[PDB]
């Protein structure tokens, strides 16, 4: 049987790379060719194209946030699961101000108005969600590894759920 031979090859290979250091954790020296490219192309490209374009986009983004009176981390959409899991655990004082800022922004945007300049002198790029995003990613990675390492077989279209993995009832068209 060829599947048995293939299974042994996979087992032996994976056993031979256990404990390997990830590529990013290796101390890597650039090749003599990438160093030349960085010496010539990268400086000129930054001065003439990348630097000005990205400053132009960044400064516009800061202005847009300041006009709405929101922070950058407010702009995250909770349809993303990491954001939703992080928002479950944020403390109440952070939550209250986040909601108020987001509500004011939508009112301003909907009515085509901008925040008064008196209230615009703040840094919008303060990363207040970072501790909770990292905790949420850790929780999700543990669940991924210890509980979702195989494609599981379940009885199909039973109890309001397709049986293909989703956990909410009536959350697909074929489960109406």
């Amino acid at each position: 049987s060829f599947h048995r031979a293939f299974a042994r090859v996979v087992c032996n290979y994976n056993k031979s790379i256990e404990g390997s250091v990830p590529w990013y954790q290796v101390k890597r020296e650039k090749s003599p060719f990438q160093q030349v490219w960085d010496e010539v192309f990268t400086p000129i490209w930054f001065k003439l194209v990348k630097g000005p374009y990205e400053r132009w986009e960044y400064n516009a983004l800061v202005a847009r946030y300041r006009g709405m009176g929101i922070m950058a981390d407010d702009a995250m959409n909770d349809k993303d699961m990491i954001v939703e899991r992080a928002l479950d655990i944020i403390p109440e004082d952070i939550r209250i101000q986040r909601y108020r800022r987001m509500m004011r922004g939508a009112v301003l945007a909907g009515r085509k108005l901008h925040l008064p300049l008196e209230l615009q002198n703040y840094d919008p790029m303060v990363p207040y969600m970072a501790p909770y995003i990292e905790e949420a990613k850790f929780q999700m990675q543990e669940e991924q590894e210890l509980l979702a390492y195989h494609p599981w077989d379940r009885r199909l279209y039973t109890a309001g759920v397709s049986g293909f993995g989703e956990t909410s009832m009536h959350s697909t068209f074929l489960t109406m």
């Binding site: 042994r8 543990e142 509980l147």
Partner: protein, 496 residues
């Protein structure tokens, strides 16, 4: 023996600095993923089980089990027995039960049990419980009145992993706010579990009434109302800093090599600091007696208990009172015991055989470090309560004298119970841990047998006389609408 702690001598285990690379070689080998594999047909697929297939088995190596005692430099005591079984029973006992709670700290001991095996410094909640599950281990945490126990049952080859997981509960638990809040569910489940066991539920009513609003009367379980205000990670951490310390903790292992167990426990505390030991208020229990009538609208039967204070486990009356319990014995209609199963105890002969209306009559005896309760527990139909109490009181008045045959039968049955209970490993683990926490010493089953043989009728009379002078504790549970009043019981016993 290098150190004597509370009357017992222990061998001091020195901390050693070991590189993580070296220790990793000794960790038991196991996998969580099986990515591929080498196919191999079952070689015994055609061999019936009646045909032996194993040959050249190494000769067995049998050693008489002995209990060994050791202690770490941080003060954690280690007691293990190796019966050469294939399953280990690891147990961590901490001297922090409900009795040490202040009224503002009500239920914190139970809360600690509820947050057990949650996230620690070096492991997540999910990873801890999935590791316990994948390795086939079972266990949990139970908070008592004087101690809290963490226990795991496992194949002995995985002892290094199990000991690490248990210790992490008291070494560096992360009492994260959201994890703790998820444990509020367990309080309602704990109440349901307690109330389901009628015998245990009546026992808790006894202790609350016997010791009014003090050490041994503190509720074992936290309530689900105002107590949830301080069911917080911060509050639990403050409670643990008061009571949890290496000096108040004992690690017990059954069916584990002592040197290996000591080595791995040492490696767990080598580079970390345990909770420092601080003085705490330890007040003797105050016995008040009293009564409580607890209605259960669903139950048609009446459960009655009459109890008296005993000096406790550390007294010289421990064995004579225990013999008194076996002499009176008891039983119930539910069961039909064969020979040697209490059919000739005094309660069985004088109550069950002569009163068809009595559903069950037994003698209970709870022992703690410095106090205990002894009494009779009798059940029946609600309307029978006035007669059930009279039967119980009449038996209490017969404890003035005992026949020689009854004393000998009681002594022999007690010795049989001691030896037969000991052979259960989980029982032996819990017995050792509780004894050290209560007394700092372990009395072996054989030594208890020697004491039992020395009990005379004079000792039984003396102990019974002392019990009957205490103010009775009178609990009625179930259908209480016909039970006599408390003053009736006290006047009946006032003569004694």
């Amino acid at each position: 023996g290098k150190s004597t702690i509370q009357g017992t001598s222990y061998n001091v285990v020195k901390f050693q600095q070991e590189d993580v690379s070296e220790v990793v070689k000794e960790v038991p080998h196991f996998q969580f993923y099986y990515i591929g594999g080498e196919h191999k047909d079952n070689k015994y697929r055609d061999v019936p089980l009646d045909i032996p297939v194993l040959t050249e088995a190494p000769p067995p190596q049998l050693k008489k089990p002995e209990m060994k005692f050791s202690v770490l430099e941080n003060g954690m005591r280690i007691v293990s027995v190796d019966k050469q079984g294939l399953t280990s029973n690891l147990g961590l006992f901490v001297h922090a039960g409900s009795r040490f709670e202040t009224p503002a700290e009500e239920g914190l001991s139970h809360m600690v049990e509820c947050v057990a095996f949650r996230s620690t410094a070096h492991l997540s909640h999910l990873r801890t419980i999935k590791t316990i599950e994948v390795l086939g281990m079972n266990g949990g945490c139970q908070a008592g009145r004087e101690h809290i126990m963490y226990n795991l049952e496992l194949l002995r080859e995985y002892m290094p992993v199990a000991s690490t997981l248990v210790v992490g509960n008291v070494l560096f638990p992360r009492l994260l706010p959201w994890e703790v809040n998820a444990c509020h569910k367990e309080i309602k489940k704990a109440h349901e579990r307690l109330k389901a066991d009628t015998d245990q539920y009546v026992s808790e009513l006894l202790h609350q009434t016997a010791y009014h609003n003090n050490t041994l009367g503190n509720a074992l379980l936290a309530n689900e109302g105002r107590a949830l205000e301080h069911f917080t990670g911060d509050n639990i951490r403050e409670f643990m800093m008061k009571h949890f310390s290496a000096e108040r903790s004992v690690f017990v292992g059954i069916n584990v090599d002592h040197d290996e167990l000591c080595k791995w426990l040492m490696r767990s505390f080598a580079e970390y600091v345990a909770i420092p030991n601080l003085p705490r208020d330890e007040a003797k229990p105050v016995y008040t007696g009293g009564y409580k009538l607890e209605e259960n609208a669903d139950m048609p039967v009446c459960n009655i208990a009459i109890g008296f204070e005993t000096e406790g486990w550390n007294s010289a009356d421990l064995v004579p009172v225990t013999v008194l319990q076996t002499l009176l014995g008891g039983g119930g209609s539910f069961s039909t015991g064969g020979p040697g199963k209490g059919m000739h105890s005094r309660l069985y002969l004088n109550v069950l055989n002569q009163n068809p209306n009595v559903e069950s009559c037994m003698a209970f005896n709870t022992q703690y470090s410095d106090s205990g309760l002894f009494g009779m527990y009798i059940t029946g139909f609600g309307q029978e309560a006035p007669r059930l109490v009279d039967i119980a009181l009449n038996e209490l008045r017969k404890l003035d004298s005992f026949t020689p045959d009854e004393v000998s039968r009681a002594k022999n049955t007690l010795k049989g119970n001691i030896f037969m209970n000991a052979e259960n490993s989980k029982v032996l683990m819990e017995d050792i841990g509780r004894q050290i926490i209560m007394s700092g010493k372990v009395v072996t089953p054989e030594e208890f047998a020697a004491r039992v043989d020395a009990v005379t009728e004079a000792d039984l009379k003396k102990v019974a006389a002392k019990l009957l002078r205490k103010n009775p504790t009178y609990v009625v549970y179930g259908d209480t609408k016909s039970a006599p009043h408390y003053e009736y019981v006290r006047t009946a016993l006032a003569s004694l």
